[PDB]
Structures are given as structure tokens and as C-alpha cells.
């Protein structure tokens, strides 16, 4: 039988200005919701490099908790 | 024309259109290709 | 075109498509031509009913859903469209959000099919019609 | 960011203020709507122009809280 | 020829097309066959492809049977005939229908028999808010060459109500464009109005500049320019905007539309939108 299945999706990162160098996000960077009703955390699994002069990027985040709370 | 040109029989003259300007534009016919350089179906061919 | 926020670009007495194969005076001709004011031409059928099967072959969507401008097809021999060749309209504005549509370019027994009408999609005329949904 | 961050923005006890920036814009104010201004960029040319009646005090974006 | 040799049988073409008395399959039956002696008869089908849809339609009628010029190769003839219409068409008689009409028919003579060659009638006819105002301006942009650019042109004459040239800036242009309708705003509409006169709610704030979120904009959005709000503009689709651009000391360049790519540097990210239902 299939066990508990993780929750995952996509998030948008927004910079103050368009980017000046080939900056990087490592796998396992944490994302958290400021809302008190949803204290569950999220983490990335694969790296990403933002391209220079870019302005937004879409990355996938995987939820540590598994169930309805994701 | 200000003096009407007598065209003799048989002789190909030409109409010779001097103009400065491309704007654009006349009409003509080729074999098939009906109505200027685009359609093809049954709507014209060559006149002359 | 939904990028125009539902403003429709110019109405047009005099445009001409290269998609021109049949009589330039059909209801269906005013339809493929004015569908060019939306910049979305289609391969020709003379019978409006053929557009439904043709739309399946040409890779379009089909159903009953209104969108601004997009064609309504009456199938042949129903309330709203003659049995010989089928009948068509272009849908300038969608009223209420479904139940009324405003239509134009419409021949329905209209000698020279320039004209305009409001169709109830509540009643048989608008329930009998069909919409294509065009591709990319 | 240097265009906006770099701004020695100061207001006297009198509500007329003094302004400096990393760009060539620099604005100084006195009693009433009177002011002194300078700039070099053509984009910023309205801020320190004298065409017709001149630039109004309300046109300067530094004149707002 | 006597042009009668056509017009006597173009009268068949009239009664078989521009007249239908009371209109049914039985009227249609003869008003087909009487054409199949005188069309370039493949063309009779080309006439079937104009027909009334009975129950919707009734008699369409030729009154003011006017006609005019000809030209003739000798025996094959082109003619224009402005055969007007009257029409009372079932419950399209709670209000009737009407037409102006104009028909350049062509005809040929073969074995003394006539044919008819150009099927022709030209039926002739005498019978959102922010975005709409923006589209009107786009449609009329090419005819507004009388309006000229200046730094702070505040003329007392309406540009659209006068053929004379006039120097207007973007704020006064906006004011005149909105003044044409039920709304008034407040003159000169210097930069203040957008803040203290309440008609607007901000969409994007100043100080951030994203090139991907430009597609989400809508036609009629007001686009600012300059570091100190020097100029403004109106957004139109396909990544363009409408504004006046030119040298500062009263340029003679008229109003015109420019691409957003080159001006994107001086956009400053500020965007605003109109709202009229709730105000006052």
C-alpha cells in the first residue's frame, strides 16, 4: 500500500531589482508561511541558478509534513 | 490623349508607363493565379 | 485577445482575407472574413453545418460556450437557421454573462446580411446554435 | 537603487527643506513656494526649467512627504 | 445596341431578386427559372445563395427603381443601376427594413441570346469605460495630427472641437479626453490630482520594475514616466503606449505611438486606474 504522500508545488521569488550576477539557491532551502493558521514548513530538493538580469524565478518546494496539512 | 494616336494594324506598340512612384499599383492577368498575385481557383487567367 | 480585456477591435465593411475560395457574398463568407478582424482565419466550407465536422478535422474545440466575437453556427434546419446551407453570426458582445448575446454580420433571411440582433440563449434560437473554440 | 538611496534629504525647523542626491539633481526651498534647483539630465530638465511660467513647486517629487 | 436589350431582361433580374410581393417557395420557383434563361446560368445558384428564410422573411421590394450609366464594348455591356429597396418582412414590420442599393451588372451577347455575368449588389445602409476611451483615441490617433506637443500647454480651446492646431501636453490631453463624456475632473490636472482627487487606485507602486508583469496590464492603464513624474501616458495592447515625445522647447512633433521597449528604462513602475461608479 502507498504510504503518506508528500505535498509539493511551485513558488515565485520576487527580487527588488533585476539581478546582477548568476546567483544560486541550494537544495534544502526552507520556506515558511507567516500565517499562524498554517505553520507548516516547506523545503526544496534540487538546486536552481537564477540567470543574470532576470527578475523572477519559479522553483519547486516539497512539504516536510505529509497529510492534509500540506 | 490630347492628340488621339492612330494605331496601325498588326504592329505591337507598347504602352510605356513612365512614373516616379510605386504607390501607383495597377492590375494585370497571368495564366491561372486569379485577381493579382494571390488567388488561384477559377476566378480569372491571362487576358492578352 | 482576452489581452484586449474584452474590447473588440475594429468593425469592418471592407476587409479581405486570402481564405477566399467560395462566393464572396455568402453568410459564411462574411463570417470567415470578419473572423479575420480577430485575426483568426479558417479553411472554407460553403455549408455552415460542415464547419462543425471541419472544426474537428482542423483541430479546433467545439461546444456551446460564448466568447466575445467568436462565431455561432446554426446547424442546418433548426430554429434560427435554414436547411439548405446552414447559417452563422459573429458575436460582438456577450450580455448578462451568458443568457443574451449581441450578434452582427448576420444573414438569416437578410438580403445582403449586414445587420445586428440580440439572441436569447435562454430560448430555442441560442440553444440550437454551436460555438467553435479556436486554436493558437 | 543609487538614484533613490543616495539622497541627503533634510528638512529644517522651517518646513522649507534642503535636498541633495547622488545624481545631479539638487533642490533648496525658502519661504512661500520659492525654491532653488539645479540638474543636468535632459530627463530631469522639467525639475529646473523656466519655460513659460517655470516649473511649479508641486511638480517636484521631493516636495511631498 | 439599344440598352433596352439588356434592361428589358435586367427587369427579369429585378423582379426575380429585388421584388418579392409576398414571399414563398412558389414565388421563388419562377423567380429561379426566369433567371436560368439569362444568367451565365451557373450563376443562378450564385443567386440562390442570397435567398430569404421564410417565417423570418417576407416581401423585399424595389421601390425608387433608379438606374444610371453604361459602358459597352459594342455588344457586351457593363451597367450601374441604383435600384433602391423598401422591405416589410413578417414581424420585421413592427419596424420595417430599408436599403440604398447599387448594382454594376455585366452582360454578354452570344448567338443573339443574352447572358448576365457580374452578379452584383452593394447593399447600402442608413438604418469598459476607460478602455473604450483609449480604443477611440487609438482609432482616431492618425487624424489628430493638429494637436502639437509642449511642456505645459494648457489651451482654453478644446482640440477635438477645432480644426486649428493647438499645443497640448499629456495631462491636458487626458483632461480633454475625459471631458467629452459625462465626467469632468479638475483642470489643469497637474500631478496633484492623482493623489488628492481620489478617482484612482494604484495598481503597482513606484520603485520596482518588472518586465514579466507588463503582460498583466490592461488597455487604458495610465503609465507614468520620469524620475519626478515629468510625463505620463496611456497604455495600449501589444506592448505599446500613447504619449507625446519630443525636444523640450516646444517641439513641433505631433502626437504619436511608440514601442515600450526603448522607453521601458524610464517607466518608474507607477501604474494607476480609473473608477467612476462609486465616486460621488
3-state secondary structure chain C: CHHHCCCCCCCCCCCCCCCCCCCCCCHHHHHHHHCCCCCCCCCCCCCCCHHHHHHHHCCCEEECCCCCEEEEEECCCECCECCCCCEEEEEEEEECCCCEEEEECCCCCCCCCCCEEEEECCCHHHHHCEEEECCC
**What residues contact residue D57 under an 8 Å CB cut-off, 6+ apart?**
D29, D33, D35, D63
Q: Classify burial at A46, counting beta carbons within 10 Å of its beta carbon; exposed 0-12, middle 13-18, buried 19 or more.
A: exposed
Contacts of E211 in chain A (CB under 8 A): 18, 55
Q: How far apart are CA E195 and CA B20, in angstroms?
A: 57
Question: How is the beta sheet containing E200-204 ordered, strand by strand?
Answer: E200-204, E271-274, E222-225, E231-236, E240-243, E256-259
CA nearest neighbour of E82 among E14, E5, E12: E14
Chains A & E: contacts with CB separation below 8 Å: 11
**What residues contact residue C105 under an 8 Å CB cut-off, 6+ apart?**
C30, C31, C34, C88, C89, C90, C113, C114, C115
CA nearest neighbour of C110 among C88, C131, C83, C129: C88
3-state secondary structure of E2: coil
The reply to whether D51 touches chain E by the CB within 8 Å rule is yes
Chains in contact with A via at least 3 Cβ–Cβ pairs below 8 Å? E
Q: What are phi and psi of C133, to 5 degrees?
A: -115, 120
Q: How far apart are CA C63 and CA B4, in angstroms?
A: 66
Measured in angstroms, the resolution is 7.3
3-state secondary structure of E168: coil
Minimum CA–CA partner of A57 in chain E: E212
Q: Report strand pairing: A8-14 vs A56-63.
A: antiparallel
Chain-chain contact of E209 with A18 (C-beta, under 8 angstroms): yes
Answer yes or no: are the C-beta atoms of E234 and E134 closer than 8 Å: yes
Q: DSSP string spanning E52-96?
A: --BTTB--EE--SB----EEESSSSEEEEE-B-EEEEETTEEEEE
Chain-chain contact of C18 with B38 (C-beta, under 8 angstroms): yes
| CB atoms near residue E43 (< 10 Å) | 18
**What residues contact residue B11 under an 8 Å CB cut-off, 6+ apart?**
none
Chain C meets chain A (3+ C-beta pairs below 8 A): no
Q: How far apart are CA E136 and CA C116, in angstroms?
A: 21
CA angle, E128 then E131 then E137, to 5°: 135
Minimum CA–CA partner of E55 in chain C: C109
Q: Tell me the sheet residues that pair with C132.
A: C62
Among chain E, residues having any CB pair with chain D shorter than 8 Å are: 151-152, 190-192, 207, 226-230, 248-250, 266
3-state secondary structure of E30: helix
CA nearest neighbour of A14 among A69, A62, A58: A58
| CB atoms near residue E115 (< 10 Å) | 17
Among chain C, residues having any CB pair with chain E shorter than 8 Å are: 3-7, 9-10, 23, 25-26, 82, 84-85, 87, 108-112, 114
**What residues contact residue A55 under an 8 Å CB cut-off, 6+ apart?**
A14, A15, A18, A19, E210, E211, E212
Q: How far apart are CA C93 and CA D19, in angstroms?
A: 54
Contacts of A17 in chain E (CB under 8 A): 208-209
CA nearest neighbour of D8 among D24, D26, D23, D20: D20
Q: How far apart are CA D36 and CA D16, in angstroms?
A: 11
Q: How far apart are CA A40 and CA A65, in angstroms?
A: 7
Amino acid at each position: 500500500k502507498r504510504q503518506s504522500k508528500r505535498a509539493y508545488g511551485d513558488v515565485t521569488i520576487q527580487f527588488y531589482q533585476p539581478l546582477d550576477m548568476r546567483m544560486y539557491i541550494p537544495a534544502g532551502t526552507t520556506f515558511t508561511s507567516t500565517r499562524q493558521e498554517y505553520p507548516q514548513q516547506f523545503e526544496t530538493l534540487v538546486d536552481y541558478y537564477a540567470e543574470p538580469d532576470s527578475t523572477e524565478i519559479v522553483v519547486e518546494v516539497y512539504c516536510k509534513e505529509t497529510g492534509v496539512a500540506g | 490623349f490630347d492628340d488621339p494616336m492612330m494605331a496601325e494594324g498588326g504592329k505591337e506598340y507598347a504602352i510605356v508607363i513612365i512614373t516616379e512612384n510605386s504607390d501607383y499599383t495597377m492590375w494585370v492577368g497571368t495564366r491561372t493565379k486569379p485577381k493579382i498575385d494571390k488567388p488561384n481557383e477559377v476566378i480569372s487567367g491571362n487576358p492578352y | 485577445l482576452k489581452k484586449y480585456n474584452g474590447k473588440l477591435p475594429k468593425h469592418d465593411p471592407s476587409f479581405v482575407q486570402p481564405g477566399n475560395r467560395h462566393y464572396k457574398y455568402q453568410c459564411t463568407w462574411y463570417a470567415y472574413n470578419r473572423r479575420g478582424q480577430l485575426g483568426i482565419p479558417v479553411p472554407l466550407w460553403g455549408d455552415a453545418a460542415d464547419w462543425i465536422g471541419g472544426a474537428k478535422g482542423a483541430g479546433y474545440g467545439v461546444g456551446r460556450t460564448p466568447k466575445q466575437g467568436a462565431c455561432v453556427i446554426w446547424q442546418r434546419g433548426v430554429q434560427g437557421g435554414s436547411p439548405q446551407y446552414g447559417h452563422v453570426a459573429f458575436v460582438e458582445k456577450v450580455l448578462d454573462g451568458g443568457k443574451k448575446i449581441f450578434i452582427s454580420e448576420h444573414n438569416y433571411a437578410t438580403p445582403n446580411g449586414y445587420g445586428t440582433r440580440t439572441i436569447d440563449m435562454s430560448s430555442a434560437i441560442g440553444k440550437n446554435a454551436q460555438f467553435i473554440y479556436d486554436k493558437k | 537603487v543609487y538614484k533613490y538611496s543616495s539622497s541627503l534629504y533634510e528638512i529644517l525647523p522651517s518646513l522649507n527643506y534642503k535636498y541633495d542626491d547622488g545624481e545631479g539633481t539638487s533642490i533648496r526651498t525658502y519661504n512661500g513656494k520659492s525654491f532653488f534647483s539645479m540638474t543636468s539630465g535632459e530627463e530631469e530638465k522639467p525639475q529646473a526649467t523656466d519655460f513659460y511660467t517655470g516649473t511649479e513647486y508641486q511638480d517636484l517629487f521631493t516636495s511631498y512627504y | 445596341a439599344t440598352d433596352k436589350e439588356a434592361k428589358d431582361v435586367i427587369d427579369k433580374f429585378i423582379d426575380n431578386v429585388f421584388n418579392f410581393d409576398v414571399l414563398t417557395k412558389e414565388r421563388i420557383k419562377e423567380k429561379d427559372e426566369e433567371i436560368k434563361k439569362i444568367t451565365t446560368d451557373d450563376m443562378y445558384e450564385k443567386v440562390v445563395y442570397i435567398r430569404p428564410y421564410v417565417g423570418v422573411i417576407q416581401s423585399l421590394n424595389p421601390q425608387h427603381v433608379q438606374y444610371e450609366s453604361f459602358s459597352n464594348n459594342g455588344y457586351d455591356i457593363e451597367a450601374e443601376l441604383s435600384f433602391r429597396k423598401v422591405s416589410y418582412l413578417v414581424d420585421k414590420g413592427s419596424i420595417p427594413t430599408d436599403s440604398l442599393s447599387t448594382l454594376t451588372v455585366h452582360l454578354v451577347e452570344r448567338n443573339q441570346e443574352l447572358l448576365i455575368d457580374y452578379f452584383d449588389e452593394i447593399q447600402d445602409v442608413l438604418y469598459p469605460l476607460s478602455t473604450i476611451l483609449a480604443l477611440d483615441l487609438n482609432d482616431n490617433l492618425k487624424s489628430l495630427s493638429n494637436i502639437k506637443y509642449m511642456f505645459k500647454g494648457a489651451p482654453k480651446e478644446n482640440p477635438f472641437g477645432t480644426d486649428k492646431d493647438v499645443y497640448i501636453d499629456t495631462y491636458n490631453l487626458l483632461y480633454w479626453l475625459y471631458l467629452g463624456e459625462d465626467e469632468e475632473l479638475a483642470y489643469p490636472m497637474n500631478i496633484n490630482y492623482f493623489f488628492t482627487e481620489g478617482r484612482f487606485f494604484t495598481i503597482f507602486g513606484k520603485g520596482h520594475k518588472y518586465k514579466v508583469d507588463v503582460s498583466k496590464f490592461i488597455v487604458g492603464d495610465i503609465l507614468f514616466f520620469g524620475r519626478s513624474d515629468t510625463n505620463i501616458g496611456i497604455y495600449v495592447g501589444d506592448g505599446e503606449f500613447i504619449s507625446m515625445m519630443g525636444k523640450f522647447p516646444k517641439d513641433e512633433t505631433p502626437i504619436g505611438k511608440y514601442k515600450l521597449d526603448d522607453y521601458w528604462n524610464e517607466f518608474n513602475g507607477r501604474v494607476m486606474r480609473f473608477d467612476e461608479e462609486v465616486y460621488i
